[PDB]
Amino acid sequence: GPSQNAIKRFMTLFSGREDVFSIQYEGGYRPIRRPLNFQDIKNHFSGKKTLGIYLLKKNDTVKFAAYDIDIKKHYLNREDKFVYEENSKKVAKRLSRELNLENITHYFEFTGNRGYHIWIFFDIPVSAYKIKYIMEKILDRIELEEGIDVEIFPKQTSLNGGLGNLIKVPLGVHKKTGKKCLFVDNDFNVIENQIEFLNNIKENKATEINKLFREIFN
DNA sequence: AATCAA
Ligand SMILES: Nc1nc2c(ncn2[C@@H]2O[C@H](COP(=O)(O)OP(=O)(O)OP(=O)(O)O)[C@@H](O)[C@H]2O)c(=O)[nH]1
Ligand SMILES: Nc1ncnc2c1ncn2[C@H]1C[C@H](O)[C@@H](COP(=O)(O)NP(=O)(O)OP(=O)(O)O)O1
Ligand SMILES: Nc1ncnc2c1ncn2[C@H]1C[C@H](O)[C@@H](COP(=O)(O)NP(=O)(O)OP(=O)(O)O)O1
Ligand SMILES: [Co+2]
Ligand SMILES: [Co+2]
Ligand SMILES: [Co+2]
């Protein structure tokens, strides 16, 4: 059925480090040094465990990347948090328009707390520095707003013997809030059938990202 | 019970 298919698709889409992943706990993240398996993602989908995925594989390539749009410390102010939520959506729209201009299929996720991830998937892994370079150049073309931060994952071009950086992956529970981390549409509305949306996510052509990298400069 | 990174 669609739901077990989505388990195998999740594995193929959020494939990062071959033999290490992470789990979100209250107060941080903990590396689990073993390959991810089916049960780990059933724990993810059920709310039992929440998974993060190290982007960089051992040869310093990634099969996916993501923008991380954050509403920074609102704290008190005048409960104007709405303006900053509005600002987070404007910034994501701006990033997303540039991605479609460059013909890069991408997907929005509500993160369960203060923002949105923009996910880009590839059919074959590409060099971490290439897509990082692309995503910095696109960030540089757009206006930003007060209270908003934009982070680019991968955060490093190369492991240097380490693990690199991880990102919490969708369809699970943000421990900080109890909310589901869910895909939304082009106007930030929650998809009703999260499973079917996942089963229809399209991968970009690695052969077209590589050409774009060179064209973006040379 | 809690790491690793920029
Ligand atoms: N690897 C790693 N990344 C972290 C850690 N803490 C924060 N980050 C990441 O670094 C980003 C910026 O760090 P901070 O500005 O200190 O965290 P923040 O919670 O966004 O800060 P404010 O919202 O401004 O209070 C966060 O949004 C995370 O992506 C950590 O302990 N390890
Ligand atoms: N202590 C840690 N150790 C390792 N990785 C960590 C980490 N804290 C965060 N990360 C990693 C995991 C995170 O997924 C990623 C982004 O950090 P956020 O922006 O702070 N958290 P998210 O975007 O997922 O949801 P929201 O912002 O709405 O609260 O950095
Ligand atoms: N004076 C106004 N007139 C019309 N809509 C208005 C408005 N003030 C606010 N709105 C609101 C009501 C509308 O729901 C909303 C539309 O704003 P986006 O979704 O950000 N722009 P688009 O529709 O083109 O989306 P996309 O690019 O993906 O195709 O703005
Ligand atoms: Co962040
Ligand atoms: Co975030
Ligand atoms: Co619209």
UniProtKB/TrEMBL annotation:
What sequence ranges are listed for the domain TOTE conflict system primase?
A: 6-211
| Superkingdom assignment | Bacteria
Binding annotation for GTP 2? K73, R114, E151
Task: Give binding positions for Mn(2+).
Answer: D68, D70, E151
Residues found modified as N6-methyllysine:
K168
Q: Provide the residue positions that the database annotates as binding GTP 1.
A: D70, K72, K73, R114, E151
Enumerate the residues binding dGTP: T111, N113, R114, H117, K168, H174
The identity of this protein, by name, is TOTE conflict system primase domain-containing protein
Specify the species.
Marinitoga piezophila (strain DSM 14283 / JCM 11233 / KA3)
- State start and end of the fragment within the whole protein: 110 to 327 of 546
